[PDB]
Structures are given as structure tokens and as C-alpha cells.
Amino acid sequence: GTTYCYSKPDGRPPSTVSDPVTRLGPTLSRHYTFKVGEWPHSQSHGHAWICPLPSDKLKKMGSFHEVVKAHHLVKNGWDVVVQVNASFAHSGALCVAAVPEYEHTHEKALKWSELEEPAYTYQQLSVFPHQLLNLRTNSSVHLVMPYIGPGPTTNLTLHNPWTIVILILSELTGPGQTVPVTMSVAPIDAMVNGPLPNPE
Amino acid sequence: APIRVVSVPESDSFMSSVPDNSTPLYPKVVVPPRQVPGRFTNFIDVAKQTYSFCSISGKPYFEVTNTSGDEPLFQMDVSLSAAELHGTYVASLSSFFAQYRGSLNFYFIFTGAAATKAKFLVAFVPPHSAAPKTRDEAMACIHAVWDVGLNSAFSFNVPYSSPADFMAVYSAEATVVNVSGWLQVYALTALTSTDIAVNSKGRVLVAVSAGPDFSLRHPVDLPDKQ
Amino acid sequence: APIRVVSVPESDSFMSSVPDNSTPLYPKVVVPPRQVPGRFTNFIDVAKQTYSFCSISGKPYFEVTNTSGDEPLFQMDVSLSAAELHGTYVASLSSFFAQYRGSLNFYFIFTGAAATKAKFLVAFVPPHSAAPKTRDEAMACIHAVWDVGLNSAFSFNVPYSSPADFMAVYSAEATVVNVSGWLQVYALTALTSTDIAVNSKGRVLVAVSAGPDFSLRHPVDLPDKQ
Amino acid sequence: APIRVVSVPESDSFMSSVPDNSTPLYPKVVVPPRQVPGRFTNFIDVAKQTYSFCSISGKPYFEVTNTSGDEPLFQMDVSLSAAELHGTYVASLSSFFAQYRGSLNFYFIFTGAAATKAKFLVAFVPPHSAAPKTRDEAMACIHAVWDVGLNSAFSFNVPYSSPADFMAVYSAEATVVNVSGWLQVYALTALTSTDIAVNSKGRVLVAVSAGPDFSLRHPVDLPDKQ
Amino acid sequence: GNSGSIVQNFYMQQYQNSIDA
Amino acid sequence: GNSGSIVQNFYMQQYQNSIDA
Amino acid sequence: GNSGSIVQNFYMQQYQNSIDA
Amino acid sequence: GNSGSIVQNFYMQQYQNSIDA
Amino acid sequence: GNSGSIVQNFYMQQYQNSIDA
Amino acid sequence: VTNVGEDGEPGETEPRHALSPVDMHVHTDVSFLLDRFFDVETLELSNLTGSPATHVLDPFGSTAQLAWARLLNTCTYFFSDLELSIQFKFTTTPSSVGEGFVWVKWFPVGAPTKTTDAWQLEGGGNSVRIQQLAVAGMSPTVVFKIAGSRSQACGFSVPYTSMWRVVPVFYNGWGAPTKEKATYNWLPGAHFGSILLTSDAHDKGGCYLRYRFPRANMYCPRPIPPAFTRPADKTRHKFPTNINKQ
Ligand SMILES: CC(=O)N[C@H]1[C@H]([C@H](O)[C@H](O)CO)O[C@@](O[C@H]2[C@@H](O)[C@@H](CO)O[C@@H](O[C@H]3[C@H](O)[C@@H](O)[C@@H](O)O[C@@H]3CO)[C@@H]2O)(C(=O)O)C[C@@H]1O
Structure with missing residues (x-):
């Protein structure tokens, strides 16, 4: 099933640049697929994998990557699909969400990592565009977020608006092994500004 | 020609909630437009179209074991200032007010592995007696049956029952508009599993x-933390 | 019959920007009419329909010699409180405000004698990195080519590129709405002349x-000279 | 532009009955609706459509014995501040005012057993002379005859007779608008009974x-109890 | 009942008091 | 939202507050 | 330019300011 | 007789004074 | 002559000044 | 499964003749909850002379238990105009200030700042110097007296000045190229602008900030902080009220 982050993505071009605008064909902003982590039997609830998009992992988008390198700003959504792998003997659930200006991160900003939320948060995480991954029901959370932020577009090198939380609700109960989480980000409606110079 | 005026007794008093506004000193400011998604209008909307996760001994779930019977599994004084609500959205939103009103929907999501199955009697017990202590005691009241393995999740509506046109967002030593009853989940059967060692x-x-009929009223300021 | 009135708390306060006017004490003054040309209405008009002359080491021009290469010839932090603007109209007009907005047009008028010719790469470099230092470095960015001896004058538009709906008329230690980039003219070739001794x-x-899209907002008072 | 105003001499005075209201500080309160029966609008309605029970030596009735004659049985100064009214509704309602106006209806309900019968001359004696003391004295005035054993209850209207457009709710040392007369019931015959020992x-x-023509006016505050 | 001025509605019927259903 | 007087527009909609596009 | 009240014309256009031909 | 303002009816004809039949 | 406000007629033309025949 | 009641039946719950309406939710209207006066802050003045500091209207920090604290924390992005009341309280014997002339000036999102005495009023020796920007002009000045002043306060409305179409109450980014600490959830001009109170009091008094935010616009709901300790198991949270067993 497909769940939308506040609204379908707009291919509108930035209300704040008289500067020339390169739109990114899918074939440039292609698709990317990596493993988040291995949800283990010990990690008590309140845990989570922070995936602030896209940075840290931006070095690895090797094409989309490339154009955002030599360009000052970008506006883009995200088709993102988190995929836990587990059998029918495992129990537990997570809740993975897209969060607007998420922050806590102990300033390990724009670096994916792992944390334990304060609780009032995991309790109310669901107050954001999120989906449930319930080990006796499904094995996939699917979301699509639109460009968002104070500016009508930003610098992905300084700001990451979207950030996926992958929260542990009910601990992993079942067979001794771990359950590998995974995620496919692929940029939607990409658009660049100001080419920067040559790396010399 | 000067108008004839009498200075109403309060005249130079302040009052922090005047239905009227102050004098402008920086006019002609046109502001930049905002597309920015998800502008909410009223707080009851997110509270209605949004599930919060309860609070029991610190975790947002309750357990069934391969051993349970009539010992009530989940129990809560139906009051906003109840325990198992403490963590949640709805509850915390209501702190911003004096009176609440309406039914609340509960979503139980059984998350035991598919090799697993069990059943519960979720029941609502009206605020009279001294609280039931066994399934066979609650059963005589409003409840339904949940066979996990028909739906792995179920919804249950805790109704609004009171001479009280409105209820108390700030409960206390038991009054007539302080509580609306008790939510209780009981274990109908126990945990059957393909292999009980796993x-x-x-x-x-x-x-x-x-x-849906939920509403809040009379905004209030915060007392000493406690 | 007297009206019932309450004296709003600020009542006898002054406030220097009241959207309203004071009481007249000398009415019926009819004034003599004025033909007098060039009455401007809004300050942005003269700023748009008018070229100011930049500031580099004290003079309003830059030099090309019969020896230059990639050494950048003209460079400026795109900020109103930039150096090479200091002398100009636009820049000084903006001091009267807080936020600027839009592109600026640059007019380079080559004034070397007709026996003479040369070329430049005028380029605009976006506010990220740490500023280029050679033509072959800037070239990868927005720029055009000026062959003096096709047009003896050329115009170049420094665009508005920012998440910032508005920008800072009063710049400072580098912020995200403090700078919009860098204007740089480089020497594409050097000075060819009929006789290099002249x-x-x-x-x-x-x-x-x-x-044309340039605008200013939020009028401000003057701080300590500096 | 400021309005020209003169501060009427009383300006900062209070006055507890202002025909106008104070400034709101908690708007947008919608109240729950009320079915709740018997909402009265005006106090004269319950006073008209409602019988109160008089006061004589502590009890709300007067006695006839098998021995009476012309000795007046029931007597009262027609004034609201009269004795036999003290207990009642009408009388007590009027304390809330200064002037009363109109006729009052009296309901006598004979309650002696059915084996029993008797008759009375209820009469009204106009406020001049020095009050009658025998039936044959009152008879010359406004009165009717009540034969208990035709109606076991009877109504009698004490009229409004006065140059006074209104009368005194708070009577005292006899004035011209202080009293409207005297109500007197006399015993026409005596108690005939099947068996006088019972x-x-x-x-x-x-x-x-x-x-029906009764009305009250000029609301007043309470003086020292007495 | 006893509200009689013109300015009695200086404030709205909605803001001033309470409202039944 | 909460502005309820009549004199609330004593000043213009333009002068008083801010204006969107 | 910057005169924005309603009472700004409490006084006449003739009395208040000056008048061109 | 001698009441001459405009604001003389600031209060109602009913509230202000007395009323004949 | 020199009376220029709007409130100049706060009082009546009859009450305020004098009246010719 | 089965739904509408009475039969022991599995998925079958009982009936609910849901409620009527009253109040039409209206109190929870974000625009209404915010259009009133809040006692946000408390600050002291500056002497008419010295080289003083401007103050910043940033009601986005929070931490102080105040209702308006949270609520602004309830949303990701915010926009509303501003409205003030400044009251000035006395901290000594009120008979010390005979005049008490107070200069206030409001500075819009992104105004210049260095101020030193620069205006000189003179007359009969002594002579006062007010601040270079306390003066009246471009940014609104407000001068009021506190000398029997039946309400020692002043007040006014001020527009959304920022150059940001909206204000991020949270920012997963930095506002500067130099990714320093402090520059975290920052992004400049994410506030209402600033003010300067200055007077022959300064000592003898504190102030009383109060904001009213008309035209409130809140984008993206966020988790709403608890505000009270977690009560014990299966119990309520008893509190003192207008109700209660007397
Ligand atoms: C914004 C500014 O210029 N501030 C300067 C102030 C103001 O100009 C001044 O307060 C205006 O009222 O003035 C400062 O300089 C004044 C100071 O040196 C005094 C001391 O002698 O003299 C002033 O000029 C006198 C002049 O000497 C007389 O001949 C006569 O003309 O009167 C004037 C003033 O009434 C200087 O302007 C100051 O002292 O603060 C400098 C501030 O920067």
C-alpha cells in the first residue's frame, strides 16, 4: 500500500531563483537500495534507525549523487520503501516514519545512526506520516514525501528536510536470528540550481 | 462639539484576553506566500485522525502468555488523567483544557508471530461498584470478542456515558464527572503456538x-508540575 | 447620555509611526502649483532606471594589461554590504532598509582605444566552496564571453538564488541569507594593440x-558609523 | 485626527445599575442546551397562578365551633405587611418591591367532615371608621354568603379601592396609601353536626x-430584619 | 432584559456572552 | 479567530496586520 | 501614503492639510 | 424641551426616562 | 467660516449657536 | 467482522448511538488559542547611556512550563503576527522615580544594531543623552511615562517580518557554511525581530513581556509533550480543582 507524506510531490520550479534550472529526469535521479540494519533480539523498544535523507549516504547515490555535487541547491521528494526480512515465527513490529526537520541526533547531523527516543515520542511518533510494520501481517512500509521546508528549496549539504525514523515498537520475539531492515530511496521530482566550479 | 464621555470604572485596567487588538506601528508589510504542506486548522482533527500509543508499565503493549485465565490483562480508570494515557497525544492535548467529551477508539494490534493465536474479551465496565476482577465477572457488561487470527488488529469504542454534558480533563478524588468507567482487556484463551519453546x-x-463526537473546551493555564 | 468608555492600557503613550495623523491648527492654506519636472514617486525606479559606477581600489574601473591569464581581475562578495558597491547608488539606497531581493545588472564599458582589443569571461560563482582562483576553475559555472570589439560595452545579470525569500541588506559573519555568491570577471585573452608602446x-x-525583480523592505534607522 | 472629547464630570464613578454591560474576556463559549421543564419568565405569573396558605395564630385555617354568633372570625388589615399574610408567597414576593397594585383572591376551603355544615359572611370593610365588631355591623358592606354544603370551598376577591394609582408594599403608621381596608369572615350560623360529640x-x-390586575414595581434592597 | 444602550453590541453577540444550541 | 469587536477594523486590513499573496 | 485609519478624515481634507491648484 | 445633542439617545427612550400610557 | 470637523455638529444647529429670522 | 451487536459473536462489538455536538470544537482552533496575551518572558531595562543590547523576540526556545511553551512545540512550521504589552514593574520604593521616561524601539527581522548614546537633549545644565537608536524614526519608537501612570504599561501590533515564508520551529540543518555548534537548529531570522527598552529607571525596575499572536498558522503536527509525571499503575492522576470533594 502507498502512503503520502502530507501531499503528492509538485514538480513546480522554485519560487526563489531567477537563476537557470536543470530538472532531473528519473534516469539521472535513479533508484537506490541499501540495508539499514539488523533489528536484533536485545534492542528493547524505543530504539530506532535514523535515516536523515539523504546525506551520509549521499556519496553512494552515484549519479543523482553526481549532479547534486556540482550544484548549489535541490528540491525533491522521495519514494522510500523500508523492507524488514523475517519469517512467520518472528513477532514484533516497528513503525517507520518520515519526519519534517527531525532533530535530536546529538548533532551527528545528516549521518544516519541509532538512538533511543524519549518515549512521549515513540508513543506519539504516529502523529507523523508513518506506516506499521507488524511481523504477523506485512513485511513492507512504503512512503512518498514531497519537497518541504522553510525555503522553497534548500541546500542538501546543510539541511535534510526529510528523515526516516525506523522505530522499534514490540521487540523482536522469536527465532534466535536477527531481522535485517532495508531501504530503497529514489528521488522524485529533482531540480537543481547554480553549478559550482571545477574541483581544482 | 467635544463628545460627552464617562470613563467606565475599570478604564485603565489590562485584561489578557481582550477580544480586540492593539494599535499597528508597522503597516504595509506584504508577506511572502507559503505552499508548505499540512497546515492544520484545529487541534481536534489530528487528535481524531491520529492514533497515539498507550502506556502500561513503561511500554506501549500488553502481554499474553501461555498461562493466563481470568486475571484482567489491561485495566484503566476512564479519565483523561489516567495512567495508560499519560504517554499519548489525546491525553496531553487535553491538558490544554478543562472539559472533554465523547467516545475514544482503541486499537489493539496483536503482534505475536503468525505461528501464534489467542483471544480476548475487551470489555468496558461502568463506574459504579468496586471494579471486577475476573472475566466471568466482566462478561455481563459491554464487551466483544477478539480472536486474533480473524483480524490481527481490532478497534473498540469507549463510549460517553454521563449525566455530565461534559467531563473532567483534570480528574481527582472520585467525583460524579471525574470518571466515566473502566476499560479492561481480559484473556479469553491463552497463547497456542506451533512451538512453545520459540x-x-x-x-x-x-x-x-x-x-468522532470527542470535543474539548475552556483553555487553561498550567499549574505546578506533579 | 455620556458614552461609556474604557481607557486602553497604553493610553498616554507616544509611538513614532502611528498610521494616523495629528490635529490641524492652520487650515485653509491653498498652495501654489508646481510644474517642476522629474518628480519621482518611488525610490526603486531611479535605482532600476539608473546606473551607478562601482568601486575597486578607489577607481570605478578595472584594468587589463598586455599580461594577465587566469588571475581573476574583478571579484566581489555578492552582498549589498560588499566592497565594490560601497560607492554606488543601489547599495546606499539599500542602507535605508533591512532586506533586498533580486538580480542586479552589471555594465562593463571597455574604454581602451580603438587600436585596442581584448576578451573576458565574466562569471558568477555560487556561495558554497571557498572561491575559485583561475579562469579554468570558474568556467564550469554561469558565465558568458565578452569580446571587446563586437560590443564595447556589455551587460551581465547577477541573479537571485536563494531559499531566502528575501536577502540581507546588512551582511556580516557569513550566514545563509548573508551572501548570494561571487561576481568575477577574468581576462580571457590579453591586450592586443596596434602599438604596445602607446x-x-x-x-x-x-x-x-x-x-527588474529587485525590491527592498523594512525601513531602518542608522546605527553607529563604521 | 484624534476625536475631540470632554470627560463628563462623573467619569470615574461606579453606579451599580448601569443599563449597559462590561467587557468580555472569555468569548466563544457555546453552552449545552436545556430541556428542563417549568422555566418561569416573570414572578407575577407564579404569584397569580398559585395559591399560598394564610397565617392566623400560627396555623393556616380558622375554626368554627358549635358556638359563635357575630364575633368576627377572621380579620386582617388589608396591607401587604399584614399579619395573616406573613407566611405566604405573594406577601413575601412583594418584599422585593415598593408598590403593589390590584385585587387578591381568597380561597376558603371548609374542611369539616361531611356530617357537618355551616355558613359565613365573608365581607370587605373600607378603610375609614374604626373597624366593625359584629356581623350586623359589617353586613351593610361588600360581602357574599357562603353556605358550606353548596361548595365546600369558595373564592372571594379583595378589590383595589384607592386614589392611589399604586399601593404600599411596606406599610406603617397609618397613611392614605398604607391600607386599602379590612377582610373579615364572620360566622353566619354555627356548626350543625350529625353528632356533636364527634x-x-x-x-x-x-x-x-x-x-389578575395585580402588579408590583420599584425593586428594593433589604433593610434591618424586624 | 436590562441591556439598553446602543453600544451594548459594541462587542459581538458571539464574543460578549454565551450561546445556546 | 478571536478578533471580535466592531472597532477591530478601526484600522485598515492593510495597515493593521500582514498580507499574503 | 501612510495615512490609514478611518478617523484619518475626522477633520476635513480642506482643514487638515494643504491644497494644490 | 432642552435635550439637544445627538448622543442624547445614546441610551434608549425606554431606559433613559419614564413612560406614559 | 473656520468650523471644520464632522463632530462640529455634535450639537444641533439650534442648540450650539444663535439663529436669525 | 459481524459489527452491530448482541450475539456473543466474534468481531461483533455492540452499538454506539454517537453523540450530538455543542461547542463545535472551536476552542481547539489553533487561530483562537493563539490570539490572546501571554506572559512570555521578563527582562530588565538598559540605562539611557552605555553601549547596550537589543533583545530578541524568540518564543521558540521554550522549556519553561507555560502552555504557550508547548503548543509552539506542537508544530514544525509557524506563522502569525505579533502583539505586545510591556508593563514595567517596580523593584524598589515607587517614590524614587518622579519622571520615568522610557524609550522603547522595535527592530524588524534583520535590522542593523550597534548603539551608543548619540542624541543629546540639554537645558539648564545636567542634560540627557538618549540612545542612538532609541530615537524616533524608521523602526517604531514608543515612549511612555511611569509617574502615577495609572497602568505602567504600553503596547502595540507588529507584522511578520522574517524573510522566511514560514518559520521552522525545528531545523535539521545549520544556518551557516561553518557547521559550528550553536549553528544547529538555527537558520537566522526565524523569529519576530527585536526590542530595546531604555530609561532613567533600568534599576528600580523589571519589565513583563507579553505576546499575542494573531493569525496563527500551524503546519505539520508534532508530538505534544506530557507536562506531568507518569502516574502509578491502574490509577488516575489526582489533582486540585474547581470541583473536588470539599
Ligand atoms: C547623530 C549625531 O550626530 N549625534 C551627535 C550628537 C548630536 O548631533 C546632538 O546630540 C544633536 O542634538 O552631538 C554630538 O556632538 C555634539 C557635542 O560635541 C556638543 C558638545 O559641545 O556640541 C554639539 O554642537 C553644538 C555646537 O558646539 C554649538 O555651537 C551649537 O551649534 O549647538 C550645538 C548642539 O546644540 C555637537 O553636535 C554629541 O556630543 O553627542 C555627537 C553625536 O555623535
């Missing part, structure tokens, strides 16, 4: 959405 | 008009 | 309804 227990998340 | 260098004036 | 006396309740 799956011995199950975790049912329990979430709370705001009721 | 014409060894050339002076390109550089003027600044306000951008 | 029924020797009879109790006629006496109630007071407000007159």
Missing part, C-alpha cells in the same frame, strides 16, 4: 484515537 | 543598475 | 392567590 508470549500494541 | 592597458568601467 | 368544630383553610 513463541511463549504475545505483544498487543494498544493505541488511542479521539472519538 | 596602448599597454585598458580600463573597463563597471556600473550597477537595480534588477 | 364533630364539634370545623377548619376552613384560607389561601391567597394574586389578583
Whole structure:
């Protein structure tokens, strides 16, 4: 099933640049697929994998990557699909969400990592565009977020608006092994500004 | 020609909630437009169209084991200032007010592995007596049956029952508009599993959405933390 | 019959920008009419329909010699409180405000004698990195080519690129709405001349008009000179 | 532009009955609706459509015995601040005012057993002379005849007779608008009974309804109890 | 009942008081 | 939202507050 | 330019300011 | 007789004074 | 002559000044 | 499964003849909850002379238990105009200030700042110097007296000045190229602008900030902080009220 982050993505071009605008064909902003982590039997609830998009992992988008390198700003959504792998003997659930200006991160900003939320948060995480991954029901959370932020577009090198939380609700109960989480980000409606110079 | 005026007794008093506004000193400011998604209008909307996760001994779920019977599994004084609400959205939103009103929807999501199955009697017990202590005691009241393995999740509506046109967002030593009853989940059967050495227990998340007839009133300021 | 009135708390306060006017004490003054030409209405008009002359080491021009290469010839932090703007109209007009907005047009007028010719790469470099230092470095960015001896004058538009709906008329220690980039003219070739003993260098004036989308806002009072 | 105003001499005075209201500080309160029966609008309605029970030596009835004649049985100074009214509704309602106006209806309910019978001359004696003391004295005035055993209850209207457009709710040392007369019931015959050893006396309740033309005016505050 | 001025509605019927259903 | 007087527009909609596009 | 009240014309256009031909 | 303002009816004809029949 | 406000007629033309025939 | 009641039946719950309406939710209207006066802050003045500091209207920090604290924390992005009341309280014997002339000036999102005495009023020796920007002009000045002043306060409305179409109450980014600490959830001009109170009091008094935010616009709901300790198991949270067993 497909769940939308506040609204379908707009291919509108930035209300704040008289500067020339390169739109990114899918074939440039292609698709990317990596493993988040291995949800283990010990990690008590309140845990989570922070995936602030896209940075840290931006070095690895090797094409989309490339154009955002030599360009000052970008506006883009995200088709993102988190995929836990587990059998029918495992129990537990997570809740993975897209969060607007998420922050806590102990300033390990724009670096994916792992944390334990304060609780009032995991309790109310669901107050954001999120989906449930319930080990006796499904094995996939699917979301699509639109460009968002104070500016009508930003610098992905300084700001990451979207950030996926992958929260542990009910601990992993079942067979001794771990359950590998995974995620496919692929940029939607990409658009660049100001080419920067040559790396010399 | 000067108008004839009498200076109403309060004249130079302040009052922090005047239905009227102050004098402008920086006119002609046109502001930049905002597309920015998800502008909410009223707080009851997110509270209705949004599930919060309950609070029991610190976790947002309750357990079923391969051993339970009539010992009530989940119990809560129906009051906003109840325990199992403490963590949630709805509850915390209401702190911003004096009176609440309406039904609340509970979402239990059984999350034990598919090799697993179990059943519960979720029941609502009206605020009179001295609280039931066994399934066979609650059964005579409003309840339904949940066979996890028909739906792995279920919704249950805690109704609004009171001479009280409105209820108390700030409960206390038991009054007539202080409580509306008790929510209780009981274990109808126990945990049957393909292999009890792997799956011995199950975790049912329990979430709370705001009721369609739910409403809040009389905004209030915060007292001493406690 | 007297009206019932309450004296709003600020009542006898002054406030220097009241959207309203004071009481007249000398009415019936009819004034003599004025033909007098060039009455301007809004300050942005003269700023748009008018070129100011830049500021580099004290003079309003930059030099090309019969020896230059990639050494950048003209460079400026795109900020109103930038150096090469200091002398100009636009820049000084903006001091009267807090936020600017839009593109600016640059007019380079090559003024070396007709026996003379040369070329430049005027380029605009976006506010990220740490500023380029050679033509072959800037070239990868927004720029055009000016062959003096096709047009003896050329215009170049420094665009508005920012998440910032508005920008800072009063810049400072580098912020995200403090700078919009860098203007740089480089020497594409050098000074070719009929006789290098007479014409060894050339002076390109550089003027600044306000951008068509250019606007200013939030009038401000003057701080300590500095 | 400021309005020209003169501060009427009383300006900062209070006055507790202002025909106008104070400034709101908690708007947008919508109240729950009320079905709740018997909402009265005006106090004269219950006073008219409602009988109160009089006061004589502590009880709300007067007695007839098998021995009476012309000795007046029931007597009262027609004034609201009269004795036999003290207990009642109408009388007590009027304390809330200064002037009363109109006729009052009296309801006598003979309650002696059915084996019993008797008759009375209820009469009204105009406020001049020095009050009658025998039936044959009052008879010359406004009165009717009540034969208990035709109606076991009877109504009698004490009229409004006065140059006074209004009368005194707060009577005192006899003035011209202080009293409107005297109500007197006399015993026309005596108690005839099947067996005088069982029924020797009879109790006629006496109630007071407000007159159709009855009205009250000029609300007043309470003086020292007395 | 006893509200009689013109300015009695200086404030709205909605803001001033309470409202039944 | 909460502005309820009549004199609330004593000043213009333009002068008083801010204006969107 | 910057005169924005309603009472700004409490006084006449003739009395208040000056008048061109 | 001698009441001459405009604001003389600031209060109602009913509230202000007395009323004949 | 020199009376220029709007409130100049706060009082009546009859009450305020004098009246010719 | 089965739904509408009475039969022991599995998925079958009982009936609910849901409620009527009253109040039409209206109190929970974000625009209404915010259009009133809040006692946000408390600050002291500056002497008419010295080289003083401007103050910043940033009601986005929070931490102080105040209702308006949270609520602004309830949303990701915010926009509303501003409205003030400044009251000035006395901290000594009120008979010390005979005049008490107070200069206030409001500075819009992104105004210049260095101020030193620069205006000189003179007359009969002594002579006062007010601040270079306390003066009246471009940014609104407000001068009021506190000398029997039946309400020692002043007040006014001020527009959304920022250059940001909306204000991020949270920012997963930095506002500067130099990714320093402090520059975290920052992004400049994410506030209402600033003010300067200055007077022959300064000592003898504190102030009383109060904001009213008309035209409130809140984008993206966020988790709403608890505000009270977690009560014990299966119990309520008893509190003192207008109700209660007397
Ligand atoms: C914004 C500014 O210029 N501030 C300067 C102030 C103001 O100009 C001044 O307060 C205006 O009222 O003035 C400062 O300089 C004044 C100071 O040196 C005094 C001391 O002698 O003299 C002033 O000029 C006198 C002049 O000497 C007389 O001949 C006569 O003309 O009167 C004037 C003033 O009434 C200087 O302007 C100051 O002292 O603060 C400098 C501030 O920067």
C-alpha cells in the first residue's frame, strides 16, 4: 500500500531563483537500495534507525549523487520503501516514519545512526506520516514525501528536510536470528540550481 | 462639539484576553506566500485522525502468555488523567483544557508471530461498584470478542456515558464527572503456538484515537508540575 | 447620555509611526502649483532606471594589461554590504532598509582605444566552496564571453538564488541569507594593440543598475558609523 | 485626527445599575442546551397562578365551633405587611418591591367532615371608621354568603379601592396609601353536626392567590430584619 | 432584559456572552 | 479567530496586520 | 501614503492639510 | 424641551426616562 | 467660516449657536 | 467482522448511538488559542547611556512550563503576527522615580544594531543623552511615562517580518557554511525581530513581556509533550480543582 507524506510531490520550479534550472529526469535521479540494519533480539523498544535523507549516504547515490555535487541547491521528494526480512515465527513490529526537520541526533547531523527516543515520542511518533510494520501481517512500509521546508528549496549539504525514523515498537520475539531492515530511496521530482566550479 | 464621555470604572485596567487588538506601528508589510504542506486548522482533527500509543508499565503493549485465565490483562480508570494515557497525544492535548467529551477508539494490534493465536474479551465496565476482577465477572457488561487470527488488529469504542454534558480533563478524588468507567482487556484463551519453546508470549500494541463526537473546551493555564 | 468608555492600557503613550495623523491648527492654506519636472514617486525606479559606477581600489574601473591569464581581475562578495558597491547608488539606497531581493545588472564599458582589443569571461560563482582562483576553475559555472570589439560595452545579470525569500541588506559573519555568491570577471585573452608602446592597458568601467525583480523592505534607522 | 472629547464630570464613578454591560474576556463559549421543564419568565405569573396558605395564630385555617354568633372570625388589615399574610408567597414576593397594585383572591376551603355544615359572611370593610365588631355591623358592606354544603370551598376577591394609582408594599403608621381596608369572615350560623360529640368544630383553610390586575414595581434592597 | 444602550453590541453577540444550541 | 469587536477594523486590513499573496 | 485609519478624515481634507491648484 | 445633542439617545427612550400610557 | 470637523455638529444647529429670522 | 451487536459473536462489538455536538470544537482552533496575551518572558531595562543590547523576540526556545511553551512545540512550521504589552514593574520604593521616561524601539527581522548614546537633549545644565537608536524614526519608537501612570504599561501590533515564508520551529540543518555548534537548529531570522527598552529607571525596575499572536498558522503536527509525571499503575492522576470533594 502507498502512503503520502502530507501531499503528492509538485514538480513546480522554485519560487526563489531567477537563476537557470536543470530538472532531473528519473534516469539521472535513479533508484537506490541499501540495508539499514539488523533489528536484533536485545534492542528493547524505543530504539530506532535514523535515516536523515539523504546525506551520509549521499556519496553512494552515484549519479543523482553526481549532479547534486556540482550544484548549489535541490528540491525533491522521495519514494522510500523500508523492507524488514523475517519469517512467520518472528513477532514484533516497528513503525517507520518520515519526519519534517527531525532533530535530536546529538548533532551527528545528516549521518544516519541509532538512538533511543524519549518515549512521549515513540508513543506519539504516529502523529507523523508513518506506516506499521507488524511481523504477523506485512513485511513492507512504503512512503512518498514531497519537497518541504522553510525555503522553497534548500541546500542538501546543510539541511535534510526529510528523515526516516525506523522505530522499534514490540521487540523482536522469536527465532534466535536477527531481522535485517532495508531501504530503497529514489528521488522524485529533482531540480537543481547554480553549478559550482571545477574541483581544482 | 467635544463628545460627552464617562470613563467606565475599570478604564485603565489590562485584561489578557481582550477580544480586540492593539494599535499597528508597522503597516504595509506584504508577506511572502507559503505552499508548505499540512497546515492544520484545529487541534481536534489530528487528535481524531491520529492514533497515539498507550502506556502500561513503561511500554506501549500488553502481554499474553501461555498461562493466563481470568486475571484482567489491561485495566484503566476512564479519565483523561489516567495512567495508560499519560504517554499519548489525546491525553496531553487535553491538558490544554478543562472539559472533554465523547467516545475514544482503541486499537489493539496483536503482534505475536503468525505461528501464534489467542483471544480476548475487551470489555468496558461502568463506574459504579468496586471494579471486577475476573472475566466471568466482566462478561455481563459491554464487551466483544477478539480472536486474533480473524483480524490481527481490532478497534473498540469507549463510549460517553454521563449525566455530565461534559467531563473532567483534570480528574481527582472520585467525583460524579471525574470518571466515566473502566476499560479492561481480559484473556479469553491463552497463547497456542506451533512451538512453545520459540513463541511463549504475545505483544498487543494498544493505541488511542479521539472519538468522532470527542470535543474539548475552556483553555487553561498550567499549574505546578506533579 | 455620556458614552461609556474604557481607557486602553497604553493610553498616554507616544509611538513614532502611528498610521494616523495629528490635529490641524492652520487650515485653509491653498498652495501654489508646481510644474517642476522629474518628480519621482518611488525610490526603486531611479535605482532600476539608473546606473551607478562601482568601486575597486578607489577607481570605478578595472584594468587589463598586455599580461594577465587566469588571475581573476574583478571579484566581489555578492552582498549589498560588499566592497565594490560601497560607492554606488543601489547599495546606499539599500542602507535605508533591512532586506533586498533580486538580480542586479552589471555594465562593463571597455574604454581602451580603438587600436585596442581584448576578451573576458565574466562569471558568477555560487556561495558554497571557498572561491575559485583561475579562469579554468570558474568556467564550469554561469558565465558568458565578452569580446571587446563586437560590443564595447556589455551587460551581465547577477541573479537571485536563494531559499531566502528575501536577502540581507546588512551582511556580516557569513550566514545563509548573508551572501548570494561571487561576481568575477577574468581576462580571457590579453591586450592586443596596434602599438604596445602607446596602448599597454585598458580600463573597463563597471556600473550597477537595480534588477527588474529587485525590491527592498523594512525601513531602518542608522546605527553607529563604521 | 484624534476625536475631540470632554470627560463628563462623573467619569470615574461606579453606579451599580448601569443599563449597559462590561467587557468580555472569555468569548466563544457555546453552552449545552436545556430541556428542563417549568422555566418561569416573570414572578407575577407564579404569584397569580398559585395559591399560598394564610397565617392566623400560627396555623393556616380558622375554626368554627358549635358556638359563635357575630364575633368576627377572621380579620386582617388589608396591607401587604399584614399579619395573616406573613407566611405566604405573594406577601413575601412583594418584599422585593415598593408598590403593589390590584385585587387578591381568597380561597376558603371548609374542611369539616361531611356530617357537618355551616355558613359565613365573608365581607370587605373600607378603610375609614374604626373597624366593625359584629356581623350586623359589617353586613351593610361588600360581602357574599357562603353556605358550606353548596361548595365546600369558595373564592372571594379583595378589590383595589384607592386614589392611589399604586399601593404600599411596606406599610406603617397609618397613611392614605398604607391600607386599602379590612377582610373579615364572620360566622353566619354555627356548626350543625350529625353528632356533636364527634364533630364539634370545623377548619376552613384560607389561601391567597394574586389578583389578575395585580402588579408590583420599584425593586428594593433589604433593610434591618424586624 | 436590562441591556439598553446602543453600544451594548459594541462587542459581538458571539464574543460578549454565551450561546445556546 | 478571536478578533471580535466592531472597532477591530478601526484600522485598515492593510495597515493593521500582514498580507499574503 | 501612510495615512490609514478611518478617523484619518475626522477633520476635513480642506482643514487638515494643504491644497494644490 | 432642552435635550439637544445627538448622543442624547445614546441610551434608549425606554431606559433613559419614564413612560406614559 | 473656520468650523471644520464632522463632530462640529455634535450639537444641533439650534442648540450650539444663535439663529436669525 | 459481524459489527452491530448482541450475539456473543466474534468481531461483533455492540452499538454506539454517537453523540450530538455543542461547542463545535472551536476552542481547539489553533487561530483562537493563539490570539490572546501571554506572559512570555521578563527582562530588565538598559540605562539611557552605555553601549547596550537589543533583545530578541524568540518564543521558540521554550522549556519553561507555560502552555504557550508547548503548543509552539506542537508544530514544525509557524506563522502569525505579533502583539505586545510591556508593563514595567517596580523593584524598589515607587517614590524614587518622579519622571520615568522610557524609550522603547522595535527592530524588524534583520535590522542593523550597534548603539551608543548619540542624541543629546540639554537645558539648564545636567542634560540627557538618549540612545542612538532609541530615537524616533524608521523602526517604531514608543515612549511612555511611569509617574502615577495609572497602568505602567504600553503596547502595540507588529507584522511578520522574517524573510522566511514560514518559520521552522525545528531545523535539521545549520544556518551557516561553518557547521559550528550553536549553528544547529538555527537558520537566522526565524523569529519576530527585536526590542530595546531604555530609561532613567533600568534599576528600580523589571519589565513583563507579553505576546499575542494573531493569525496563527500551524503546519505539520508534532508530538505534544506530557507536562506531568507518569502516574502509578491502574490509577488516575489526582489533582486540585474547581470541583473536588470539599
Ligand atoms: C547623530 C549625531 O550626530 N549625534 C551627535 C550628537 C548630536 O548631533 C546632538 O546630540 C544633536 O542634538 O552631538 C554630538 O556632538 C555634539 C557635542 O560635541 C556638543 C558638545 O559641545 O556640541 C554639539 O554642537 C553644538 C555646537 O558646539 C554649538 O555651537 C551649537 O551649534 O549647538 C550645538 C548642539 O546644540 C555637537 O553636535 C554629541 O556630543 O553627542 C555627537 C553625536 O555623535
